[PDB]
Every structure is written in C-alpha cells, then in structure tokens.
Design a protein around this ligand. Structure first.
Ligand SMILES: *C(=N)N(CC(=O)N(C)Cc1ccccc1)NC(=O)OC(C)(C)C
Ligand SMILES: [Mg+2]
Lengths: 67, 216
C-alpha cells in the first residue's frame, strides 16, 4: 500500500522477512485505528489531548518502554 | 495579577530535543538535561553534555538497559566531571568508558530528591532551581502517540515507573494545569519532542514519585 511504503521509507524501517513485515503492518493498522478513535473522542470533549502517527507506529506501547 | 507559570526554555536553560534511539538510555538524557539547566544557571553558557559518557561509564546503571538519574549525578561528582556531547558523542549503544578529562564541561557537588508523590514540592523545586529529572509511566498507547494538548489518562500507573524525562516548567492550557516535559524520542514524537502532562491530578503517571536534581 502507498501509505505503508511511504511510512517505512520515511522512518527507515526494515523487517527480517514477510511474516515480520506483515505482523508489524498489522500493529501499525491497529495503531492508526486507535489514533482515529481517540481523536474523534477528543473532538467530543472526552480527552484533553490528541494523538498522531510517528516513527513508533509499528510497535506496541509496551514494546516502546520494555524490549 | 500574572499567572504562576515557569518555562526555562524562555531563559535558554534547555538544549534541543535529542533521540535516544533503540537504546534504554532515557535516564542519561534526563540526567544531562538537569545538569545542562544547572550549568547554564552557574556559568551562563548552554551546551550539550554527553549522555554516552553516562551510558558507557555509570557502573551502577545498565547503559542501554536502564538506570537512575541519582546514580548518574553521584558518578559525575565522584568522577569530578562529565564531558560535553562534542568530546564524547552518542552512538546509541554501550561501549567502554572512554571518559577524557580534557573534554570536561560540568561538575556536580551532589544531588537532591523531591519528597515522594509531592507535586507542590516538585513545583517549588522547578520554580527555584530549574529543570528537574522525573520518572513516569510512559507504557500506554495514549503516550506512545501523544501529539498535543494536556496528557491525562486515568489508566496511567503511578506505581509503574518505566521512563525518565525532564520537567522544564509548568503552566495551564485551556484551564488544565500541566508540567512542561522534554522527552528524548526526537522531534517526531509529541509537540516537537515535548509533552504537557497533567499537574495536580493526584500525581498522574507518577510524575513526582522519583524526581531529582544535581547540585552545582
Ligand atoms: C528508558 N530508556 N528506560 C530504560 C527502559 O526503557 N527499560 C530498560 C525498560 C524498563 C524500565 C523500567 C522498568 C521496567 C522496564 N527507562 C528507565 O530507565 O526507567 C527508570 C524508571 C528511570 C528506571
Ligand atoms: Mg497499549
């Protein structure tokens, strides 16, 4: 997909094989969906803050601060 | 009257946002940021101190495997100095302690700990001393993708400290009190590498649970 390719190129992402890349693409798709919902909720006064996709889009929140 | 607000970025106490990368050196970035603030306050000069010096040389910490800001300050003291970024650059992986006294940019005569969970004491420290090293729960997706506004997530665990950052001030936005927090995940995270974290919301993310600063 054009967006996934541009994301990987921009953040210089590399994967070890097709399974690893698809598994990381799946986490990224789930994070995009999370961001969209939270921001909708923020537009309705549910949150005092908003979110955006960044270089950590293909990781779990736990992975970011663990291993 | 004027609001009770502080932002040390406006006084040139704060260096630009760094990127720790794929290394668990958040504590080293937090430590140098606190040291940078005090060096500016003492000598009037603002320069990048070496996180890599702390990663490669603080034996009581684990370089890319985590550590404490207090242990970093104690090393700088016992070592009678820390080098600049220029004399000891960041490579984002631990190596052997190539500390060089010729590149010394700062010293430390001890450190201070804010009383556990006391946000008012943290506030007074930031107001009177300058940037203060703090630890938080950074483990939520809400933090991972933070972009703008005042970060307040009730799921955030103050008994689960896993990340070190720098409190460079405090204020209020849209009636929400905040801490001005400098992160070490580069300028592509947050608001150009910064996050506003909720202030006086029952010690949200443990912001005042493990807060410390160097004496210079
Ligand atoms: C920050 N870079 N950092 C290290 C890290 O993320 N590790 C090693 C994972 C981890 C940290 C804390 C608890 C469990 C796992 N964080 C860090 O050093 O955190 C403190 C709380 C300052 C030790
Ligand atoms: Mg999560």
């Amino acid at each position: 997909d054009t967006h996934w390719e541009l994301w990987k190129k921009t953040h210089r992402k590399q994967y070890n094989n097709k399974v690893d890349e698809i598994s990381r693409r799946l986490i990224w798709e789930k994070n995009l969906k999370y961001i969209s919902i939270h921001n909708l909720e923020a537009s309705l006064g549910v949150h005092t803050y908003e979110l955006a996709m960044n270089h950590l889009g293909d990781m779990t929140s736990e992975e970011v601060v663990q291993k | 009257r004027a609001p009770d607000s502080v932002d040390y970025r406006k006084k040139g106490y704060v260096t630009p946002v760094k990127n720790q990368g794929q290394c668990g050196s958040c504590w080293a970035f937090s430590s140098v940021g606190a040291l940078e603030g005090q060096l500016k306050k003492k000598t009037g000069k603002l320069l990048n101190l070496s996180p890599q010096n702390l990663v490669d040389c603080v034996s009581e910490n684990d370089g890319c495997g985590g550590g404490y800001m207090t242990n970093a300050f104690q090393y700088v003291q016992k070592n009678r100095g820390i080098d600049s970024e220029d004399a000891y650059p960041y490579v984002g992986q631990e190596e052997s302690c190539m500390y060089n006294p010729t590149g010394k940019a700062a010293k430390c005569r001890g450190y201070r700990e804010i009383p556990e969970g006391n946000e008012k004491a943290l506030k007074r420290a930031v107001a009177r001393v300058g940037p203060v090293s703090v630890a938080i729960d950074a483990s939520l997706t809400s933090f991972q993708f933070y972009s703008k506004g005042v970060y307040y997530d009730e799921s955030c665990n103050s008994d689960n400290l896993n990340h070190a950052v720098l409190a460079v001030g405090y204020g209020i936005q849209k009636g929400n009190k905040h801490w001005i927090i400098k992160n070490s995940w580069g300028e592509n995270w947050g608001n150009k590498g910064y996050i506003l974290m909720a202030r006086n919301k029952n010690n949200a993310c443990g912001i005042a649970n493990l807060a410390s600063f160097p004496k210079m």
